[PDB]
Design a protein around this ligand. Structure first.
Ligand SMILES: O=P(O)(O)Oc1ccc(C(P(=O)(O)O)P(=O)(O)O)cc1
Ligand SMILES: O=P(O)(O)Oc1ccc(C(P(=O)(O)O)P(=O)(O)O)cc1
Ligand SMILES: O=P(O)(O)Oc1ccc(C(P(=O)(O)O)P(=O)(O)O)cc1
Ligand SMILES: O=P(O)(O)Oc1ccc(C(P(=O)(O)O)P(=O)(O)O)cc1
Lengths: 349, 349, 349, 347
């Protein structure tokens, strides 16, 4: 029952200022941190060989887009490899991002592993040596980080063990990040797979997020220096009932209002399986929801910002500006959506 | 991980409507629910005998003040006895309250009991047969309830057992109230006794409230149909260090922003040991605090609304209007304070 | 992390001595504590009116059986009414029990109540005023108590909430009993209803018992002064697969070896839906199970000791000796079974 | 509320048989798994240079003692390096251990790390890639593993966070081991530092162990295929009050009887700060305690088995026979103590 402060006032200020910079009005996050296994599939989807040089070129493609994205992008998440690559002009990518007014982020988790005794559930590893990696990433230009936990809605899932363990590892990761001046993004993703309906996803999301923020409290996490990266509340991919974007927005906002303390600086949704345009409408509806939302509601999009750019690129160097244009389109679209400015019964929740 | 709805949409709307009526702008709660053992202390302090008649008269004195209190008082909490008494004009007190535009509340707990193996810590009893009582109180005009848990800041307290146990019984009480159409006020009071400083009270309050709302989630409580009745974050009564009202307001709003989900309809502060004027000033500073506060921040005052009325009464029949005037003063003062309209480095928190 | 002892060594000795007397070798408990609503059903099965006198006579019939039961019955559980009734010769029933070498027990819970938001699950009430009741029961001759919690195996049950809440209320009850020199019997009954198999029951029983003993630790319960009243591990009533008595015994002892600390003085199984002969055979098989069992394994039987006696009685005063003989037969049978002397691989668990 | 079995019956049998071999009557564990930084302190204490060869030689010294230790030693815990070193006759140390009737163990954690917001409390790291390491150690002859968590008795410690977090990481480590056919030794150590008395240690030990076994239940651990490595219940190093060996035994057995389920196969005590003889006397008292003890109560000793051997060696190759004799003495002493045959309600 006695306080042994984890952070000084100066440390708290740095973390709060970083978090606010990332989700400042009209701004969101580009998730360009696809692991080397995940980036392989993207390149194979456009028949391009997965070489370090192709990965560098594609990342450079997104980071050097014209200055129209500067007011759209508050932060860019990178994979380890990309953090130490350089643009053609010799500038390290963290410097490119900074010079366009962005914060640099680093994904630090090491993937999921199975939880024995469960119905195919997982936790996430990566805590070993994390403090030294974070101190190193801080030196090399990173100011926030990402850690992804995965949960699945099934007949017996997510179980009490899975929720508790994923919530606990998220808190540990957040604790280590804040000790090294890094803002942790807490991502408890509930997959959209299955035939569950909207209200079931809302129920599960509410139970996961309540576990998350109890754990963050237990581990003394400074919420003003955190961000939340949740799934939107949506029906399962295999659900037959159809829902309006207004219903998606109402259920999403409702789940957050019931679990996310106001001290959290911002919520940066993941797009999941949504299409580029679907992810922009939904995010816009969420910001038009009449209910009171005491946190920034913006984006941390990977595919929903890159899908078109990747295809217009096709691996051909001469399609550089055509691909950048598709990326700039989505960045401008979602900069409007996270302000509710995008145009192409609460008791029931 | 499967939903079995505790409340229908129609039940939710009733509870939410009640909760909002109570904390509507400019309105607060009169706490006239002193148990017969506590009201005995009040009458003794003005040398008045503790008879049912004096208790009935004293309550009548407050409930029948002139219509300047109608926009100030959203709700009145009563003890069991008073709920079935009548004013001099024969009208049952619940009818008097409603006719003046107030909601009727009832205290339903049966006092504290010791927790074996702890250093003088307690839990609260009163769950047995609570559902049938609630159904009866509902019929007889009550629309919300009160339950008081007490925690103490000390060398080894509040302990993990004390926090877990009091949070859990509050959730049981709230669950039963909502099944019977009654809005539960959740009151986990941290006593101001001791020489602890402001930061220690803020730390305990943040830990206690995190446990409360995790327990409310585990028990499926509908937060829009609840109110929270917490202490303000203050130093101990015996703390040597001095603090401004702005500092108390900053500590209080920070603790709440870090724990209370936006879905909670209102926060009705208890006055504790504060004087009448001190309680109104602090509530006013709380409502002027620049930070974002997504709930109503109003009052549930007993002593802070009654102290002057009681002394002016003194048991004399002829001092009725002198006493009623002192109560109308405090009702008007606190109606202004809960709007920030009353005049007599956040990272360091 | 600081001990504030709940009990003195003298208090500990008293509780431990009571507990060992009850489950001394060859001894078990007669459960004659049916509520007036539960005993009414039994009387109706023999077309006998539910009057206080018939209830008195029936209880007298059991309590005054001939002295062949004295070494069989270490304790007798009574309902409130029966604790204050007298035999025909004027002797209070507690004195009847004590003079035959038994300990007097009292049922102290006030029945189950529904948990809102669950699939028909319950918790139990009765804590209100329990401390005053226990001290009074102690004065009037009772030395141990019983509290029944009920959990159900279903598609989504027992839930996390139901396990947590019932474990917590059992520990509260146990703490209060021990403060008044009363040995608590902790009864977390998992019902046999449903089509579940033996493995499913063993799993649930293991998780229930683990939660029970964690709660008892959190509440500072003295295990040597407690007894456990669990179900045997059995298939559901509606299960099609058939199991031998040796498999039931192996599953039961395995579940217990994995969850019950050796400090627990004894285990007094409930019979559930089992017949008189079935409950005796299983208990015998349990005590012959080759595994190591560091606690007494005996019986706390109601129907499995009374069924034949109740039928032979039929309400007729003249069937006294015929009825008593049937009760004595089962008491002698079960006294042999709890020693493994009654006659009418493990890695797969 | 639905079972998804973590282990098959075949997997349970393998784990149970391993665990029973390690703690078979008269047998205990030699803890020779000192990390490279801890063994550096040991060698420095006898003015010996910390070289791979010196570490190899010292470990060989212990593992090749004469066959009088065979009935005393059910298991040997090794550090990663030693697992892949060889004796002078070319045999890998795991083969040496097995040929003398012992089971090979491996330390798999990666040290303690601070818990932010606490008063100097720690958790332990080492889960990343533990499944692949365990599978590899199994191929290379290891059949059980060790993971150490450390807790401290202070004015505000151990806190709810530290107990919960350490209990949870222990359960994760135990879960991964059992999926790879390795018996986990669960070691939640409460340090003897401080001026606390016996009662305080008994209280803390009971709370820590209750949390450990709830965690292990939550994570579906097969207790019959696990071992416990706890401290003995003793007063703090700086406590003025004196206690007899019978009181230490009574407090230790009582703590265990109130927390450790009978299904656990064995309890292998750590020696902590105790001298070789103090550890042997206390272990003997524990095994003679009149209360009923449904698990093997033996030793997992490092310093309490090696102290005299290290000093008799002194780094000199010609003291090989002298050093080995001192080790065989303690192995014989403690093999008797864990049978209770060694002689030189208030809880
Ligand atoms: O679902 P897919 O179509 O296979 O594509 C994926 C899958 C997972 C991820 C993860 P990772 O980078 O850790 O692999 P994250 O979304 O957290 O970046 C990224 C892209
Ligand atoms: O501090 P005191 O001078 O003793 O006055 C008191 C003490 C307690 C209460 C309780 P109760 O009504 O349950 O007794 P509550 O604040 O909940 O009304 C009310 C007034
Ligand atoms: O099995 P049934 O036919 O429904 O009869 C019953 C049902 C419940 C009980 C309870 P109670 O006495 O508290 O009501 P307990 O098992 O605790 O004696 C006793 C007999
Ligand atoms: O107390 P010291 O004098 O510092 O010696 C020590 C300290 C710690 C250990 C650990 P480690 O080998 O993991 O560091 P373990 O007890 O687990 O072997 C071993 C020896």
């Amino acid at each position: 029952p006695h306080s042994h402060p984890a952070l000084t006032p100066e440390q708290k200020k740095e973390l709060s200022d970083i978090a606010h910079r990332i989700v400042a009005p009209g701004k969101g996050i580009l998730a360009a941190d696809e692991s080397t296994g995940s980036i392989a599939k993207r390149l194979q989807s456009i028949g391009t060989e997965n070489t370090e040089e192709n990965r560098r070129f594609y990342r450079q493609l997104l980071l050097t887009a014209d200055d129209r994205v500067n007011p759209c992008i508050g932060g860019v998440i990178l994979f380890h490899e990309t953090l130490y690559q350089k643009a053609d002009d010799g500038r390290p990518f963290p410097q490119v991002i900074k010079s366009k007014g962005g914060v640099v982020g680093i994904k630090v988790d090491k993937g999921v592993v199975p939880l024995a005794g469960t119905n195919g559930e997982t936790t996430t590893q990566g805590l070993d040596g994390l403090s030294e990696r974070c101190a190193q990433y801080k030196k090399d230009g990173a100011d926030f980080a990402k850690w992804r936990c995965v949960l699945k809605i099934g007949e017996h899932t997510p179980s009490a063990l899975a929720i508790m363990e994923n919530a606990n590892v998220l808190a540990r990761y957040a604790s280590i990040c804040q000790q090294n001046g890094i803002v942790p993004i807490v991502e408890p993703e509930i997959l959209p797979d299955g035939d569950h309906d909207l209200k079931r996803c809302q129920y599960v999301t509410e139970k996961v997020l309540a576990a998350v923020y109890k754990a963050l409290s237990d581990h003394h996490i400074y919420l003003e220096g955190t961000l939340l990266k949740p799934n939107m509340v949506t029906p399962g991919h295999a659900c037959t009932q159809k829902y309006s974007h207004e219903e998606i927005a109402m259920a999403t906002v409702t789940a957050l209002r019931r679990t996310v303390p106001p001290a959290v600086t911002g919520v940066t949704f993941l797009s999941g399986g949504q299409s580029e345009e679907e992810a922009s409408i939904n995010l816009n509806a969420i910001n038009k929801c009449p209910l009171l939302k005491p946190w920034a509601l913006t984006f941390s999009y990977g595919r929903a910002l890159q899908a078109s750019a990747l295809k217009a690129w096709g691996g051909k160097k001469e399609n550089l500006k055509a691909a950048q244009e598709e990326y700039v389109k989505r960045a401008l679209a979602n900069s409007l959506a996270c302000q509710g400015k995008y145009t192409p019964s609460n008791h029931a929740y």
